[PDB]
Assembly symmetry: C2
Amino acid sequence: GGKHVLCVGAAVLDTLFRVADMPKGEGKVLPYEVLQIAEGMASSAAYAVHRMGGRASLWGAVGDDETGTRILRDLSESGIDTSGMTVAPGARSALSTIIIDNRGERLIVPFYDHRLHEKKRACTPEDIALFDAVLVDVRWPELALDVLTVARALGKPAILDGDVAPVETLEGLAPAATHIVFSEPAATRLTGLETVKDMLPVLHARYPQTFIAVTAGPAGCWWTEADDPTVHFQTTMQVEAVDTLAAGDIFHGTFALAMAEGMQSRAAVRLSSVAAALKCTVFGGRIGAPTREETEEAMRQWLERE
Amino acid sequence: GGKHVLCVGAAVLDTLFRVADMPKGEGKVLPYEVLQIAEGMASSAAYAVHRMGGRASLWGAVGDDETGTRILRDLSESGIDTSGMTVAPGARSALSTIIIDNRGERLIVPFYDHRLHEKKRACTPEDIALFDAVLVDVRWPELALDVLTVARALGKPAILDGDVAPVETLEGLAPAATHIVFSEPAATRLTGLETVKDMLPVLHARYPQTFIAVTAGPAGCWWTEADDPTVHFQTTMQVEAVDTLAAGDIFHGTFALAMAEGMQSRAAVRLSSVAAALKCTVFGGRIGAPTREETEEAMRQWLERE
Ligand SMILES: [Cl-]
């Protein structure tokens, strides 16, 4: 069972090369560990939904190529329903190299073909009525807009992962959502302010009927509820940040599932925070996404810390 | 038709990311062109044999994985007989990221699983008698040793691509070959001398019954014939070096084919040099390997330069 969450957006073949020292120019660096993993904001959020006890579907695009075949196979073997994914004929599938040093710092070299997302993908109310919530990233904005709109019309949580994108893109999607979780950099760009707590008053005023959260990694999460300007704050669990790649995605997927489950806001922010924290302690992007059980137990112990 | 050359060694899925500026630390660099190409020293040499009008077979290892499937498919679609390639069960196939800036300089992040080459691959005189020459790289030394030995026993050119490797490896393979083409760095390591022309006297004395060449890229090629210490030199064609990746491989494959064809040494060094030069003017590793016709015409014009 479990609630069913539709995730919409990125599906990318990452190759993660774990090195001691970050390269600083031409030459050669020998990796000591290499992982190829299909991930991306929506895909990792979908994986988190699955890991956290929900059912996950993903709408996203690959090309009709070998990288695409591999993305589809990995994602469905990882517990995600890929049956509604788009194969964009003549597009090349997204892939990235990420070089992760022994500080957990990253160098990313991403390949992205815009042709992936140039064709209209169908989004009917009958399609969406099958889901309990929807979560969309900034990667496929014209589909994301439609999914948010239809979901909200149907009375469903319509959640925007408001990560870095052109301001235009963020401003286009934000008005369609019932819930937005911005990353600190996205919120910074949108508000032009520096400190996260100062961004919530402005973001609430702009979208006063919307749930708005801004995540700040180890610094916690600030949010405002629909129709109320009170700013709430929730600290996160402190862990050793081995690999923060996909942390926000694990957060978003957990949060989207918590909404589909009807969870109170602070409970949902806590669960998402702990899940993200757990994932940060394991090298490999989304691969550290914890089970629901692991998150619940961690959270229990954390809530009793001294 | 065409002579048939066996190439033995590396088979690697390269992803080549073409960037303006070489990254210098963590962050992100956006590529403007991305090419995925199966190559590696032996594989590219094999491709050059094909492009230059010969028939090429490759013995090399991949894992039973998706990267392996892709390597095999690319190489056979590129005109190479892959029917004798080894699928090493439980090994992971080799892949690399190469970031190539607008100076044509490179940063390489190679993944290699030694398990690829831990099992014995058969090498019978009946297998080898089907080839007109053999060319081996330093990547699979125990197979390379056998292929060189059997080929030479059969009266065939037995050519060593003497590129960078442990000195032990180079010293183990060199005595089995009828012809060795060392890269400047390999010859430097083996002799401990600095200037290429000074390396030929020592390398001839060590292997006096062997054809020995040392390539120096745009600086040309020095060599000694079997049984004679006279050092010969051949300048190369000056080109704009857009991408020198695989240049030496194109050289070796052409040279191996020239030997299978019974070509005189200077003619063979010239043809290999021009072929390598041509390949350097095109971005993308081995993808610039010229046709036999393109090389012959270029060489004709170059030999009439003023
Ligand atoms: Cl692949």
